[PDB]
Amino acid sequence: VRLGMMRHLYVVVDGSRTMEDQDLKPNRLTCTLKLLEYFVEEYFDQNPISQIGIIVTKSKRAEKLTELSGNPRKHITSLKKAVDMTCHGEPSLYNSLSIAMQTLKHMPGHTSREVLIIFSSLTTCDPSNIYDLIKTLKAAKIRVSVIGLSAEVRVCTVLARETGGTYHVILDESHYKELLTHHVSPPPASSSSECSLIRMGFPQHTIASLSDQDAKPSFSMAEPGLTLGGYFCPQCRAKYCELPVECKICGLTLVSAPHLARSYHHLFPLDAFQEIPLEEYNGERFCYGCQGELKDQHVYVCAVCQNVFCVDCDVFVHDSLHCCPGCIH
Amino acid sequence: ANKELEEKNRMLQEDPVLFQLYKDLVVSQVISAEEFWANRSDIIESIFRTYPAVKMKYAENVPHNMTEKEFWTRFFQENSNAAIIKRFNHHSAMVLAAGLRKIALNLKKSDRYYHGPTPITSQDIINSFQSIRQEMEAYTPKLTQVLSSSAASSTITALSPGGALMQGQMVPNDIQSELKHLYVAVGELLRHFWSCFPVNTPFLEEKVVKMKSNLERFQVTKLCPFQEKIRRQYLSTNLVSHIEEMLQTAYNKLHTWQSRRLMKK
Amino acid sequence: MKLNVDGLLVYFPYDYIYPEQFSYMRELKRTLDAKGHGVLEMPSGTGKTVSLLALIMAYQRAYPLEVTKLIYCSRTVPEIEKVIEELRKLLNFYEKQEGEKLPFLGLALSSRKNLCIHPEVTPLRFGKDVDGKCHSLTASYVRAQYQHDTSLPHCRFYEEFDAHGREVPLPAGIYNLDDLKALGRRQGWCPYFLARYSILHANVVVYSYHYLLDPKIADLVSKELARKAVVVFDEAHNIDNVCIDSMSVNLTRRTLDRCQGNLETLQKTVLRIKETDEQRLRDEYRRLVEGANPVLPDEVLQEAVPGSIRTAEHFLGFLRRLLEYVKWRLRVQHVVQESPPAFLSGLAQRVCIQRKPLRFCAERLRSLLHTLEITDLADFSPLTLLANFATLVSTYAKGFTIIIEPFDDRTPTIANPILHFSCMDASLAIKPVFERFQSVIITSGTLSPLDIYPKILDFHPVTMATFTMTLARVCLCPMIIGRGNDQVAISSKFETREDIAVIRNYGNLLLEMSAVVPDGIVAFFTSYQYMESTVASWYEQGILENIQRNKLLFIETQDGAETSVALEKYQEACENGRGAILLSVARGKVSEGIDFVHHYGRAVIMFGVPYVYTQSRILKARLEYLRDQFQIRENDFLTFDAMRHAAQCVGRAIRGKTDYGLMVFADKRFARGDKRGKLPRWIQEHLTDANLNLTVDEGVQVAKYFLRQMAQPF
Ligand code: SF4
Ligand SMILES: [Zn+2]
Ligand SMILES: [Zn+2]
Ligand SMILES: [Zn+2]
């Protein structure tokens, strides 16, 4: 299934009073903020070309905590600040969705617009009806995948399925990581969603030519001191401290080569390995992947390389490395 | 109405960055300000929205020989039992009415990724393979073969800052603020200039903006060297050449694309 | 999905059936095979009709001679409309399997008020007014006048229906009330009478109880033609109340005053008739000598002779005498009086009215009324009510009682006394159903134990089967909260109702539950007066305000118009994220009428056991007789009524499609073994002792946990 390589997802978090309640081990709001930090850090770590923007809705008002950006550190910093947020009021789903729609309305067609709403308080007081907004969202091809907390509220139930997104509820804190971890992967592009080519430029890192000859002093582009060398642009010719950052002038995405290669594993998912507990003529006592003795009655094998991988190797391969070591050969 | 005038007053002093750079475009009398903007309690309110009777009363009972404190007093003021049920149903209904305003993927060449964007007889394999096969029949030469005083010492000298493989100034600070102001000044005005440049815009209405923007590039950059000249003639140190690239490269893109326009015609 | 039942092979449209369904079909077949009346309970409101219907279809094909027609009744017409859809879906599936049309006809009857095509009766909504107009249009004089084709509006639909509807019966098809109305329009035939004719040959006929219980109308449409028919009732747990209400007739001072005025109009009408038409109408006297319907059942009904009353002048005085006796006997100021057999003796001695002439008064009134060519029966409807009461008392009083209330409750002094003739046993009015029809299956949900029904209704069931729904996921999660955070008794006892803590505990439970319960929740109280006091107590405190902040709250009132608007707003709240807390009374008409489905009444709350005011004499007479006869303890039946009624309103949350919904009982009384025993099997068996006495806060926590498990998909 073709996926949306570049996606603009908004993580809407409810500043409802229900977040004050501590059903989980720590305060619910802190737990979401703590774990949301993992998603934000991991979201870019598995999709560099994508960008994220967080919204916090409290006291029936939806305020953009952070705009769309490609730097996880900036977003993470806002999360740390938001820990001490008052968290007093009632959320307004219409206000939150309207805010996201305005920003996402002008987004390019190629990108896969998405929204992730962390619903905590089952109540949703809104200035106007949301069904009209729901119709607008479908015409706007925005995927809203709410993640409820301790409530299978009907209003969000129609929202996820009608809009094409997915709804979920937190069975427990451990299950909470799985739900958001699932959304890290680029959701498949549906029939309605379309794709298009996107222009991009690769900023070649440059430093002083020859012992500060014809140097290129400059400070930064969004107390930055003078920099001897930094990333430039094919068109901006502006010094960018770090990548990937959208051109502040061109509007064209700048991204290094490794970043694009980071998402190739999505295109070629590794086929799952059949699990056979018995040895099954496997004469290699040591696991091929890790050269470690198999102390468990479990084995994994490919359909091409037909190698042997223990539980630890298969877990690691399908979790992080996203490729079969021996089958590369 | 004078909507723009009120907007300017709100941003006149509330936000320095927005107004600071806009004035600079007029400090030297570069271009007209028209193109600048052209291109770019709770409790009473709840009762105001909820109870129409209060809304009607407020309009008719607008403060006249009275006090707001007295008005607040008027708010809280078997048959009586039914009133609570009716009021709550009416109150709840009013609140409800208040919030209701009237594809499998496929590919043809996957090997290209394996040899990705990064760019770049037979007997030799046999000859080399046999020679190395007999190489290690003598092993454990660690005593002297691994390193020598001369070889080890040579490495240390190389690792020194003077040696090979080890290659190895914030004097202006007040001028830094001006450059940052200039950098934002350049960034502020290039954005509009480059807003329509990437898109061809084969339309007179959209192309006219390009011509005005293209001409405006000279006007804004006409005054740029004058400010540059003052800064340059201070100590002839820490030359600022990067700022020139954006303007010079903007010219080159302007001249080249403008020339390309003539060829297309 | 054909099912090879032990008795035979039964077609089934849906993909799969739960194990309880296997028991349902075989249990039903057992009674059908034995051809004996029985009673059974099945939890699921939806899928029960099709499973019930599916066997009958297979049974009818296997043994067409054994069963003539199917009579499947439903409580309310809005609910019977969805039933025929299930039958329509089954017929298409069965017809598709066969591949050709089969001699199967299904239709639903109803009153002319609900369905009709005549423009004149369309604007009218009152049921009585519709009959008056239709009767006048279809009156013999209009029909006789229709032959003359004089200048007068004649209802064309009935005129052509008689010439056409009589000759050609509809071969087959399924026609709901909405569909049936369209058929009459295109064919120019009565949607009502056409259905009535179809009853002669209609494999499946479905209509409300009031068309099968009251002898006035039920008997005529339920003629002996159904010698051996599978008559079935749906959700007929309160069958006795409907059955008894049919016999019960209420005479009031306002009604009596209307009768006196109507009687004067009747006297004036006779005077006009005498001067205008005497000879032709006098012929009916010969017909009377030769020899709106009587409420007497088949055996009880008598038509020997009209009696002494044989003329309009004589008959009117007879009603004049009887009306005065009731007028005087009603105006008497005293304690509530009971006199089932003595009222007939008192009336007979006081004003010299023998019972035998008085028995035919109701029938004579209709016959005499027909001779008067009246404009409509709506104006004189109260007079017929007195006539129906007049004949009923004179017919039999063994299982009845005349209750007179000079002073009405809830009023220190009222000048509008009401004379009650409430019955005491429902077996009397339902008796003809049992003999006329070989077997009757009383299928119902939330049914308190079956063994009592044979005691209440004089019948011998073939089987007593209780079914509990079996699903891969435990949809319903019942609980009883008898103890609050204060660990104080929370029973809504009459003496303990005044307790502030008990009232506070309910507010705390609702406030806390509203926080966890998603959009859609309903709370049931014991009475409107108690509901107002609890609401007022919460209103004075901040509990109600906090509840309002947590979710929207709606209260129910006696008037239907307010209830309809509020209920419509409630459904809007659930659709949005606001949610609504609809406070209602268990015995209010809103609770029985409304049905709660997914994201509607998610957490049904039963605030206190539902009990009626014991001071009500009418209930006492009914309660006393059940203690006097059939050997039922007074408290047992009273608890039975609450337990059966409490289960009635709270069982809607599990309508069908395995939509998660929890039920919380805010009373320690339910935790008692006696209350649990009377609880329905499906609700009872799922309920466990561990959660039986959950604390108000403890119950909330488990409710939150319960939602989590149900929230995730399968
Ligand atoms: S005769 Fe038929 S069409 Fe006319 S009013 Fe009666 S039911 Fe309606
Ligand atoms: Zn650029
Ligand atoms: Zn291994
Ligand atoms: Zn492999």
Short mmCIF file of C-alpha atoms in Angstrom, two decimals, chain A residues 16-18 21 23-24 28 89-90 122-126 130-131 149-155 168-172 175, chain C residues 513-519 549-551 574-579 598-599 602 660 701 704 707-713:
data_model
loop_
_atom_site.label_atom_id
_atom_site.label_comp_id
_atom_site.label_asym_id
_atom_site.label_seq_id
_atom_site.Cartn_x
_atom_site.Cartn_y
_atom_site.Cartn_z
CA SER A 16 -9.39 19.69 30.04
CA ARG A 17 -9.80 19.46 33.79
CA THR A 18 -10.18 15.69 33.38
CA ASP A 21 -7.29 13.30 37.35
CA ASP A 23 -5.76 7.39 36.75
CA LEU A 24 -2.23 6.48 35.63
CA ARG A 28 -2.38 12.22 33.38
CA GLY A 89 -11.09 24.65 31.51
CA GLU A 90 -13.14 22.71 28.99
CA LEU A 122 -15.56 13.26 27.18
CA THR A 123 -17.36 16.61 27.12
CA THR A 124 -16.87 18.84 24.06
CA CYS A 125 -18.35 22.34 24.30
CA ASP A 126 -18.03 24.09 20.95
CA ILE A 130 -19.03 20.19 14.28
CA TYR A 131 -20.78 18.06 11.63
CA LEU A 149 -8.42 8.62 27.13
CA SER A 150 -10.80 6.60 29.32
CA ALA A 151 -13.81 7.22 27.06
CA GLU A 152 -15.29 5.75 23.86
CA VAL A 153 -17.14 8.97 23.13
CA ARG A 154 -19.53 8.80 20.18
CA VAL A 155 -18.62 12.23 18.79
CA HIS A 168 -8.43 4.37 20.00
CA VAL A 169 -8.62 4.39 23.79
CA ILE A 170 -5.87 3.98 26.39
CA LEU A 171 -6.26 0.54 27.97
CA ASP A 172 -3.22 1.34 30.13
CA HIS A 175 -0.77 0.37 25.74
CA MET C 513 -20.56 8.78 37.00
CA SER C 514 -21.23 11.62 34.55
CA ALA C 515 -17.49 12.34 34.61
CA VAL C 516 -16.64 8.83 33.38
CA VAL C 517 -19.83 7.93 31.49
CA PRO C 518 -19.53 9.01 27.82
CA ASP C 519 -22.20 10.97 25.97
CA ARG C 549 -20.58 21.53 34.14
CA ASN C 550 -19.75 17.85 33.60
CA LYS C 551 -22.64 17.28 31.18
CA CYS C 574 -25.41 12.55 22.38
CA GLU C 575 -24.71 13.10 18.68
CA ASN C 576 -22.49 16.01 19.68
CA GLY C 577 -19.89 15.85 22.43
CA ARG C 578 -22.05 17.68 24.98
CA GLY C 579 -23.91 14.59 26.16
CA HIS C 598 -25.59 2.57 21.34
CA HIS C 599 -24.35 5.92 22.67
CA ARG C 602 -24.98 4.38 28.09
CA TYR C 660 -21.63 -1.87 25.33
CA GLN C 701 -13.81 3.15 39.09
CA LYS C 704 -14.31 3.44 34.00
CA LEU C 707 -15.61 1.18 29.39
CA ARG C 708 -11.92 0.70 28.59
CA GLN C 709 -12.36 -3.00 27.79
CA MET C 710 -15.48 -2.36 25.71
CA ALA C 711 -13.94 0.72 24.09
CA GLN C 712 -11.32 -1.31 22.24
CA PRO C 713 -12.54 -3.18 19.13
#
